[PDB]
Amino acid sequence: SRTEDVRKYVVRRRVVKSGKKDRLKAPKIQRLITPRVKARRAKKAKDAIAKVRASAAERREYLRLIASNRRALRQRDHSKKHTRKVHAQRAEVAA
Amino acid sequence: QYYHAHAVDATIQHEKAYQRQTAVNENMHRPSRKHVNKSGHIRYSKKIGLGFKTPAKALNGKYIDRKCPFTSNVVIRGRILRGVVHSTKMHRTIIIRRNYLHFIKKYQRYQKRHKSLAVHCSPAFDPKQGDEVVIGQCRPLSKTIRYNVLEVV
Amino acid sequence: DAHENSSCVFVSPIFRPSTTKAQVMELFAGVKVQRLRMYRQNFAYAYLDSPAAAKKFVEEKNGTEFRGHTLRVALSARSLEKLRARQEAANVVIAAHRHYKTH
Amino acid sequence: AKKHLKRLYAPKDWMLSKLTGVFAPRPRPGPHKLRECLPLLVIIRNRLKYALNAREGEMILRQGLVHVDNHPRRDGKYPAGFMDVVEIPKTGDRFRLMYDVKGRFALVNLSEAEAQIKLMKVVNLYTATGRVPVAVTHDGHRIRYPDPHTSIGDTIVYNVKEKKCVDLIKNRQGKAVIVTGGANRGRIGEIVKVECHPGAFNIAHLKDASGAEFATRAANIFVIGKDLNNLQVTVPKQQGLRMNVIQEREERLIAAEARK
Amino acid sequence: GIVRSRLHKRKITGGKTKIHRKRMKAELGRLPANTRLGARRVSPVRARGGNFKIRALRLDTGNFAWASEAIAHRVRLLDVVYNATSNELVRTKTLVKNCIVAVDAAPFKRWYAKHYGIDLDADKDKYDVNKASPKLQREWTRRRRNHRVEKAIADQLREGRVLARITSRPGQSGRADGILLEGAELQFYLKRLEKKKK
RNA sequence: AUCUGCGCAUGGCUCAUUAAAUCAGACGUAAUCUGCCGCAAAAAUCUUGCGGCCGCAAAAUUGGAUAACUUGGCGAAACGCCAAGCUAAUACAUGAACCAACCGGGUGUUCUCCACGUGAGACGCCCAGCGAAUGAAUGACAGUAAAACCAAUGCCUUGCAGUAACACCCAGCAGUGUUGACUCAAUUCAUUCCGUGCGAAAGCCGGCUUGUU
Numbered sequence A: 001s002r003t004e005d006v007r008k009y010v011v012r013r014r015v016v017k018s019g020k021k022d023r024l025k026a027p028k029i030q031r032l033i034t035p036r037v038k039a040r041r042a043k044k045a046k047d048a049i050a051k052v053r054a055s056a057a058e059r060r061e062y063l064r065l066i067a068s069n070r071r072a073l074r075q076r077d078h079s080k081k082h083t084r085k086v087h088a089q090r091a092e093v094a095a
Numbered sequence B: 001q002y003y004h005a006h007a008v009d010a011t012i013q014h015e016k017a018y019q020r021q022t023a024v025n026e027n028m029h030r031p032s033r034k035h036v037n038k039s040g041h042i043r044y045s046k047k048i049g050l051g052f053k054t055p056a057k058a059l060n061g062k063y064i065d066r067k068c069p070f071t072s073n074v075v076i077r078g079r080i081l082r083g084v085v086h087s088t089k090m091h092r093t094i095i096i097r098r099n100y101l102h103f104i105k106k107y108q109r110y111q112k113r114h115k116s117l118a119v120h121c122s123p124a125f126d127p128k129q130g131d132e133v134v135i136g137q138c139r140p141l142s143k144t145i146r147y148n149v150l151e152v153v
Numbered sequence C: 001d002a003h004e005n006s007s008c009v010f011v012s013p014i015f016r017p018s019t020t021k022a023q024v025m026e027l028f029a030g031v032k033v034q035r036l037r038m039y040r041q042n043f044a045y046a047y048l049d050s051p052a053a054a055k056k057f058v059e060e061k062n063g064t065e066f067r068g069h070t071l072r073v074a075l076s077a078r079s080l081e082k083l084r085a086r087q088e089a090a091n092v093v094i095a096a097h098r099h100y101k102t103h
Numbered sequence D: 001a002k003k004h005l006k007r008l009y010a011p012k013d014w015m016l017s018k019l020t021g022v023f024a025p026r027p028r029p030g031p032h033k034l035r036e037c038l039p040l041l042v043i044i045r046n047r048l049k050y051a052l053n054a055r056e057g058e059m060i061l062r063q064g065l066v067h068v069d070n071h072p073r074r075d076g077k078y079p080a081g082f083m084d085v086v087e088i089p090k091t092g093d094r095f096r097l098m099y100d101v102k103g104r105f106a107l108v109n110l111s112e113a114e115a116q117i118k119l120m121k122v123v124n125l126y127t128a129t130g131r132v133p134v135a136v137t138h139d140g141h142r143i144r145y146p147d148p149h150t151s152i153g154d155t156i157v158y159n160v161k162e163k164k165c166v167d168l169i170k171n172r173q174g175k176a177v178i179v180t181g182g183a184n185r186g187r188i189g190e191i192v193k194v195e196c197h198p199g200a201f202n203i204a205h206l207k208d209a210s211g212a213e214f215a216t217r218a219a220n221i222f223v224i225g226k227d228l229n230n231l232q233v234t235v236p237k238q239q240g241l242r243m244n245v246i247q248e249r250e251e252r253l254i255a256a257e258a259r260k
Numbered sequence E: 001g002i003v004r005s006r007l008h009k010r011k012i013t014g015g016k017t018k019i020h021r022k023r024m025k026a027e028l029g030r031l032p033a034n035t036r037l038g039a040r041r042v043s044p045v046r047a048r049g050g051n052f053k054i055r056a057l058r059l060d061t062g063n064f065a066w067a068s069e070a071i072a073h074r075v076r077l078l079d080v081v082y083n084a085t086s087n088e089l090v091r092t093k094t095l096v097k098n099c100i101v102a103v104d105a106a107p108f109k110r111w112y113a114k115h116y117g118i119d120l121d122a123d124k125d126k127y128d129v130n131k132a133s134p135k136l137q138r139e140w141t142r143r144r145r146n147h148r149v150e151k152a153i154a155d156q157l158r159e160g161r162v163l164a165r166i167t168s169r170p171g172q173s174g175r176a177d178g179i180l181l182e183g184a185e186l187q188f189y190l191k192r193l194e195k196k197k198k
Numbered sequence F: 001a002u003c004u005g006c007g008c009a010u011g012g013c014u015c016a017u018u019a020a021a022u023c024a025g026a027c028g029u030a031a032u033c034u035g036c037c038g039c040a041a042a043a044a045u046c047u048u049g050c051g052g053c054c055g056c057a058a059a060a061u062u063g064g065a066u067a068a069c070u071u072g073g074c075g076a077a078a079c080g081c082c083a084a085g086c087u088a089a090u091a092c093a094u095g096a097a098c099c100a101a102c103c104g105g106g107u108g109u110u111c112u113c114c115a116c117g118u119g120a121g122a123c124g125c126c127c128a129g130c131g132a133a134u135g136a137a138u139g140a141c142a143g144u145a146a147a148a149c150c151a152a153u154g155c156c157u158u159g160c161a162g163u164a165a166c167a168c169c170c171a172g173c174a175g176u177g178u179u180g181a182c183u184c185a186a187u188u189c190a191u192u193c194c195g196u197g198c199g200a201a202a203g204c205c206g207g208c209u210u211g212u213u
């Protein structure tokens, strides 16, 4: 069943040699992912979303700078126009 | 009720396939005045660089030329040479001659030499044999043409 | 801060094409208003008699639902006396411009 | 696809003797061009003398002991060209690659807060997907959001540690520039005029500290400061001042005599 | 194999070029697709660089655009009616770029009815123009007050099939997209088609 | 050992061919392709496990092969070969909802208002990723001054001074790519992509402190 240890049921073959000691050979369990592997896999997605959010923040910074520069130019121009217009209206009042 | 469409120009439509510029759509009902000449038609005409003026015939003409540097995707790049018209017997193509003197070192004297070139002449120009022209290098338009006429002097 | 002492108030959202001046007035009932201005950006400016009343309106009308919309109310730094002074200045200029046209 | 590079075909500025071998380390593609780069093997063996041969150079490099622009490089064929900051933390080397008046590569020693700064000449500007303005520099960097006043030819001051731009120097008349290619390579002067030829190469005329006028194609200049005195980077010993050859010969002879 | 080099060509002087090298893979050519009108069938071709060209051997539908309305619809190709190169390319029903075809006008009629509230078929599954809400009716008059349609196009939509011009290369892209003929281009090609029938 | 990845298009050799050829200096490619390598970018994707399409939950516990090997071999041999049994991959195939944004286009005989429709606002549902195809639109301007009137629309107040734009939730979140030149970069809208594209390799290894971040 799921949630059951697999390493306990793996096939172990017996090698017998003259003298020496009995050897037990078991395969390396492939595709068996531990909690460490799960942490790595989740960290990948976390990093991806963090990078995309950081890029969006950088775009917001650049757009704010551009819009602020345009705003400053606009209100400088309008202040100069207001000064010219008020000088024009001063002459208009009382001929 | 119904949109009155433009008529077909019988003096331009002679090629058994409709002649049109591929940069603009002449069939749009409300053009945007970006590509509109003084006659109200839809013409694509770009400004090539190097301080070369777009001819008035290129701006307000009726001709269709897929290889004209002013009304097509042909760009001018590389060499800008100068020559005299030698032959005008092809269609939309002229032969120019570049006459120069080559210095022979041993005898310390020059000798006259020439180099014929096949050049594409847009309908915006009407050069005669012996006229003096400026040509700009473009991409291969045929097996011999690598230059386009930019101005007739 | 230039808003705490002021008697002007900003209230959003008020959709002029869907709300009448009297309909905004029934929301603004209970406090006397010198004038009420509605703008295309779906917001209104009101100018109350006293800064105390203007302040008391804000925390009691902030977050409440008006015409099915959650509503935000803030203290505005503009002043009705400044508006009246600017209109008084502009009226003579309007008259002078009208005379200049017929000159 | 060529993999080899003969010693005779190798650039002369590498200073590789023609009798030592037949081949030279071919620079791998990367930041700088093959003709305008100094490979890390050459830097670590023929310049710093840390490695007696290519084997020891490989043992040094494959450990990541040599950092170029705050990043360890394990390749001895890495280009590692102009304006690059090369630091060996184990020996604390910290030198920048520049040009001297003779046109040869020079290792200008740096300090802290100066090894963190690198100058980059903007060679291209284009809009990437999402309408993102990107500036491409002379070392292959692609700056994702440069200064709105950045234009092709201007230089930007880059913080290699923080990976951010800190200042922009426009390419205007009166600015201080160093010549990057040609016969005047390594010389430092101020722009007095830039003759513009549409369709062809622009010609920048420069004048150095001594007042000697010299010209070069506008693609060979590199802005390094707002004035000939206020430079934004440290330069080699000669300060980009070309000396008369006769005077240099007599001075060298006098110094050699004074030594003995 | 097939090559695209100028070595086999005679010089402008009339001389014969003496070839001193073998043919190269960087100058090769390939056999044409000869795309016909039929059920869709394509074959990939590994071009230089690893990319793929979809050599279409047969095509039946495609994306055809009403340019004056800035829209496009996927319709069936009913016929090919004119080729400038030769009439053998019309007999064999060969689909090439800039060839004139007849397509299905039902999607264009339906879009016209949905967008402007005008039913071409009515005056002579289908959309109902009387079902629309009166907010959409105000939408229709705003659109209708700037735009007028051509009688030549409207007549074709009523008939059920409308002439079109292929704007894509089927032997390279693998698809047959196009544009509806309008204006002087429609009147040019209609005259050629009348010459054939008489 | 054998799968897997990469290289083997370099180097070495020779000078037979070869005169609008080759080559040299000087230029192009805005007519193109480009693995390695540099600096970057990436919000498409209904998956999984449990109970009865639904419900409930979520560190996604994905699936078939097939070598080496073994067995029986064929062939005079052959940098020759069958057939059957194993068994993996960063080989091959498959596949990840939520978290998780901004922004647009089309609509509903949808409701709520307001006026008696260029109304407004919710709500529904249909699409809105990169790359590609076709079609429209951008990709600026730069050779003139004043009043009227009408319709709408902003304000001022209850007639136009004054007034970036914009009917809330963003009161400046691009009104501004590049070149000598572009049908180019990029953006938006319409419709399309059928393998002939697109994983977080469903990958590996370390540290520590030993961590469903």
Ligand SMILES: [K+]
Residues within 6 Å of the ligand: none
């Ligand atoms: K292999």
Ligand SMILES: [Mg+2]
Residues within 6 Å of the ligand: E088, E091, E092
């Ligand atoms: Mg036939």
Ligand SMILES: [Mg+2]
Residues within 6 Å of the ligand: none
């Ligand atoms: Mg070789």
Ligand code: NA
Residues within 6 Å of the ligand: E081, E082, E083, E084, E086, E087, E090
């Ligand atoms: Na025909």
